Amino acid sequence: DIAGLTPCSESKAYAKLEKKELKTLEKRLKQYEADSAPAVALKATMERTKARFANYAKAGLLCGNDGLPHLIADPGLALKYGHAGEVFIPTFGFLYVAGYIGYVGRQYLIAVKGEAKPTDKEIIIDVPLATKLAWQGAGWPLAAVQELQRGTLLEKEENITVSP
């Protein structure tokens, strides 16, 4: 109960929706022989379904009046009430990989600018240079702040403009 909400292990619409999905799977299962190949896949779907409900109720997700889990996207209401794995932990688990790709592509461009003709190594990617920059880009925030402290991250007004 952060903003009119309720834990999903407490709310009854969540359990009613679990029983609704298991009821649809059960009346779907009632047509087949108990050991046939469709019935095995239907019971495996039931097992994945029940494991999904158990692990959404276990992590302390907040349900609403609809019986559906919600995501508190504010630190200080996620850190204080234990919901940092909703948004606040994957908002850095994403940005590590985002700045990773943005650093690997940056360094692949800068390490191919100073050649004979760079464009041929942009349609035909130099794979050993690409995999070297793929592995050694693991510490990208480190190298990014060390590049920002120089001023070698930005370029000055050598850039191309029109008519200011």
Binding site: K117, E157, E158, N159, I160, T161, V162
Partner: protein, 64 residues
């Protein structure tokens, strides 16, 4: 004497209406006459018309 940059020096364009403004190319020839735009610069960057070369004047030209 030979006015302008040399035969193969890198150069920076100061013509604001050009496609290669603040952008670096190679001088390939400087015309030694009373031509308004003697400095011929070739670029790797082609423009929208697909052209990599242009004439420029002496005030629209600065080295490096």
């Amino acid at each position: 004497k030979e006015v302008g940059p040399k035969r193969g020096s890198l150069v920076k364009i100061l013509r604001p209406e050009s496609y290669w403004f603040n952008q670096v190319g190679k001088v390939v020839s400087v015309d030694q006459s009373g031509v308004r735009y003697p400095v011929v610069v070739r670029f790797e960057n082609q423009n929208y018309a697909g052209v990599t070369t242009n004439n420029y004047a002496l005030d629209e030209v600065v080295a490096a």
